[PDB]
């Protein structure tokens, strides 16, 4: 029954993949409330989000960039420390939550790889002029204002690069 949702260049996204983010989110995943305009109205944005995800995965594969297991270990430890919940007990919880441990490993791996790829390819297209930093510091300092500058510049550059890839990639909806 699992069809193919769409095609992305040399890869595809399939229906069970969006399933892992439609019935596994929005009254699932975490903070069940989230947003309820409608799921039928939300079908469009989840599809566009996942196809963008697949595009970034293809990109990161093209640069030959990989993540080893130790980084995943530190990442899952950090997830444990922010969740204030022990790792093995989270495994036992996700056993009944509907999230398999191996599927969890795969999704954490791809989330890490997409995050690091977007970071690495955005901070090249972000410039800093050592003049606006002084003026912004005088507005309100000592590399602190640079954090806000970085956050804002990333905020625009992320969407810019996402639409850049989206326009210049083969996409077509199948189901």
């Amino acid at each position: 029954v699992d069809c193919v949702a769409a095609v992305v260049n040399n890869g595809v996204v399939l229906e069970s993949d969006v399933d892992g983010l439609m019935q596994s989110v929005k009254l699932n995943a975490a903070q069940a409330r989230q947003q309820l305009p409608d799921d039928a109205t939300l079908r469009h944005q989840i599809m566009e989000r996942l196809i963008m995800d697949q595009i970034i995965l293809q990109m990161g594969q093209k640069m030959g960039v990989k993540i080893s297991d130790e980084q995943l270990d530190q990442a899952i430890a950090n997830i444990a420390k922010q969740n204030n919940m022990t790792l093995d007990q989270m495994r036992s919880r996700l056993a009944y939550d509907g999230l398999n441990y191996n599927t969890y490993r795969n999704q954490i791996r791809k989330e890490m790889i997409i995050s690091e790829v977007r970071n690495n390819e955005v901070r090249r297209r972000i410039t800093i002029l050592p003049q606006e930093v002084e003026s912004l510091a005088q507005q309100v300092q000592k590399d602190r204002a640079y954090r806000m500058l970085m956050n804002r510049k990333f905020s625009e550059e992320a969407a810019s690069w996402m639409q850049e890839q989206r326009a210049s990639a083969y996409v077509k909806i199948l189901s």
Partner: peptide, 8 residues
């Protein structure tokens, strides 16, 4: 953003 647990 909707989900709480996300990429670290």
């Amino acid at each position: 953003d909707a989900a709480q647990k996300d990429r670290a």
